[PDB]
């Protein structure tokens, strides 16, 4: 009936707009990527910096933290995904591996394990790699527009992505062949995320609507909309239990829609520019966000 | 309470050190200015950037980052060539650059409408209304030759040129033909109409004439950056 939160904490030190953000499996630490080129690892529980990686290329659009909590992947408009060490015995963060082969700007990346990774790019394809040798093993194709999101399902065997054409497509990693496609939206996707049970998955759009789909479904479940809002959506998220949903908006604001309530509730306001990313801890003790105003305001 | 001792030691050793380093690096970060470059395939943008770099790249097979310096103020310029033709998404990564360099092929009248549409889209884009754009027109000498030969006359793509008249603002160059100036400033006004009709004070477009061989473009970009920052300062220091 009503939802509200305050800016519990704030992270300061980034010198430009934050484009990406990701935690680690250990919820106390989180990665952050900014156009300034710094992949700062912050100690969340004490709002402290623990590392400062100088990225090779300033134009970063992605950032990922390995499930083991050691390796961190970074990349963006340079068409390359780079890996670094954090828990190495040398005591200094250093490059471990670099992945190359895409023909478009890197859009998302996600670790599968300590020795594997999956990624999506703006060349209308997704790829799977081996960390040990840095070689491809399966490439995914079938979209028409740029791909701009990923959501590795908890059953990592399957994953889904959204594109700039009116379609979102599913791929099974070991088989490398598309097996479903939905097309309801009119102005197409910018983000996607999965449900803990894995059957349903959310999605953002350029038109002022959020929509839902499910694996068992061959139909667009629904679409949320508000009459007075024109701008688009920029990201999504889920709850620890998963029932409740959320998203980020273009007009310097968030807007919390819920599927179970099926209607919106409140807003997280306080940024003075676009919100470009979101995220929650693996344990759900805290929630974070990023913005083009360079503050990862962490909310109560 | 050895846990508290370890926490204090880790905090003191790590955060102080790396935050001192971070301030040191921020000092460098502010002093450096970053600019985006745009242009058509047949435009001279690659040649322009190469000339500036020679006047004094950080990547290949992707972003063609470049460095240059003027008046001991360090600059960065970025050319995104490692992407397919669709622009509407990756373009907004540059919403915070000081300015956007926009190059057009004025001799290629076929693309003049395409470049006009692209410039319209850039000018009215939600995330670029606050970012000044620098306009560059090239292959100007070919315009007179095209008028003489008329393989694809100006009127074929813009009949407004026939009814058009040279403006009082016109400043024909010393060794330049007048009617060629008429047509050249005519296309300039074609773009400036888009610039001004729906523009606002929070935006500006600076036209300039040049061929790729000209080295002054770095200083022009520098001076227009000065102008942009000066207006942002007027707004910031409460003079407006």
């Amino acid at each position: 009936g009503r939802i509200q939160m305050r800016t519990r904490r704030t992270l300061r030190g980034h010198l430009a707009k934050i484009y990406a953000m990701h935690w680690g499996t250990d919820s106390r630490l989180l990665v952050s990527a900014s156009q300034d080129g710094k992949l700062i690892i912050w100690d969340s529980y004490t709002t402290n910096k623990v590392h400062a990686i100088p990225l090779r290329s300033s134009w970063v659009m992605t950032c990922a933290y390995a499930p083991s909590g050691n390796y961190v992947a970074c990349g963006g408009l340079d068409n390359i995904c780079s890996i670094y060490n954090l828990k190495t015995r040398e005591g200094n963060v250093r490059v471990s591996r670099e992945l190359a082969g895409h023909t478009g700007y890197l859009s998302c990346c996600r670790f599968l394990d300590d020795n594997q990774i999956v990624t999506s790019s703006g060349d209308t394809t997704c790829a799977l790699w081996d960390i040990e040798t840095g070689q491809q093993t399966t490439t995914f194709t079938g979209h028409t527009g740029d791909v701009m999101s990923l959501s590795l399902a908890p059953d990592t065997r399957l994953f889904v992505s959204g594109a700039c054409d009116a379609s979102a497509k599913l791929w099974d990693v070991r088989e490398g062949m598309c097996r479903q496609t939905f097309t309801g939206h009119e102005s197409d996707i910018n983000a996607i995320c999965f449900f803990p049970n894995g059957n349903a998955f959310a999605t953002g759009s350029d038109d002022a609507t959020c929509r839902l789909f499910d694996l068992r479904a061959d139909q667009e479940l629904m679409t949320y909309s508000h009459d007075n809002i024109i701008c688009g959506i920029t990201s999504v998220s889920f709850s620890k239990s998963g029932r409740l949903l959320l998203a980020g908006y273009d007009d310097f604001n968030c807007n919390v829609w819920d599927a179970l309530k099926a209607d919106r509730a409140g807003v997280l306001a306080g940024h003075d520019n676009r919100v470009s990313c979101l995220g929650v801890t693996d344990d759900g003790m805290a929630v974070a966000t990023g913005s083009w105003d360079s503050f990862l305001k962490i909310w109560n | 309470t050895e846990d508290q001792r370890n926490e204090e030691k880790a905090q003191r050793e790590a955060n102080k050190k790396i935050e001192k380093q971070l301030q040191k690096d921020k000092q460098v970060y502010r002093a450096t200015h970053r600019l985006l470059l745009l242009g058509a395939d047949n435009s001279g943008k690659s040649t322009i950037v190469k000339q500036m770099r020679i006047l004094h790249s950080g990547g290949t097979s992707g972003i063609f980052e470049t460095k240059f310096q003027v008046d001991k103020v360090n600059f960065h310029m970025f050319d995104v060539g490692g992407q397919r033709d669709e622009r509407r998404k990756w373009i907004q990564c540059f919403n915070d650059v000081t300015a956007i360099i926009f190059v057009v092929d004025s001799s290629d009248y076929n693309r003049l409408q395409e470049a006009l549409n692209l410039f319209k889209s850039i000018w009215n884009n939600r995330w670029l209304r606050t970012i000044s754009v620098i306009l560059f027109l090239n292959k100007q000498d070919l315009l007179a030759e095209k008028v003489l030969a008329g393989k694809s006359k100006i009127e074929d793509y813009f009949p407004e040129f026939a009814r058009y008249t040279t403006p009082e603002d016109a400043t024909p160059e010393p060794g330049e033909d007048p009617r060629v100036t008429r047509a050249k400033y005519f296309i300039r006004d074609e773009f400036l109409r888009i610039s001004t009709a729906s523009g606002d004070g929070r935006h500006y477009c600076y036209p300039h004439f040049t061929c790729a061989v000209d080295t002054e473009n770095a200083r022009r970009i520098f001076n227009d950056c000065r102008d942009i920052i000066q207006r942002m300062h007027l707004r910031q220091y409460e003079l407006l």
Partner: nanobody
Framework: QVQLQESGGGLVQPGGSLRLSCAASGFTFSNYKMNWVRQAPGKGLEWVSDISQSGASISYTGSVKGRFTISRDNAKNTLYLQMNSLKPEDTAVYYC?????????????????????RGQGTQVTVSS
């Protein structure tokens, strides 16, 4: 599915013009910007006159200026075109197209190859 289907075409000659009718379906018509776009033998894509949202404003380029009749109608979700001063150059696939986002003047990629939001088009046989 988001699609724009065109109808009308065939026999044409100098001094004689057909009527081009477009059928937008499964997509909100008024609030989006509209515009034609053509492709002809031996050349790529070319821009054509537009009509703003709710049919407010119009624009043209030189080759087409003052010789074709652009218009939009909410009663049929259609654009219209009738030709004057017809030439063999009229032969082309008339892709009924629309801009990617609503309530905006941005139409970045309508001319882009493999652009999603455009129709199949129809052809006219200019002959004499």
């Amino acid at each position: 599915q988001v699609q724009l289907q065109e109808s009308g075409g065939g026999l044409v000659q100098p001094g004689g013009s057909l009527r081009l009718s477009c059928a937008a379906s499964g997509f909100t018509f008024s609030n989006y910007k509209m515009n034609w776009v053509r492709q002809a033998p031996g050349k790529g894509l070319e821009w054509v006159s537009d009509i703003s949202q709710s049919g407010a404003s119009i624009s043209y380029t030189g080759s087409v200026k003052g010789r074709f009749t652009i218009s939009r109608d909410n009663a049929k979700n259609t654009l219209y075109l009738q030709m004057n001063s017809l030439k063999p150059e009229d032969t082309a696939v008339y892709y009924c197209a629309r801009c990617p986002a609503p309530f905006t003047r941005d139409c970045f990629d309508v001319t882009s190859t493999t652009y999603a939001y455009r129709g199949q088009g129809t052809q006219v046989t200019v002959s004499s």
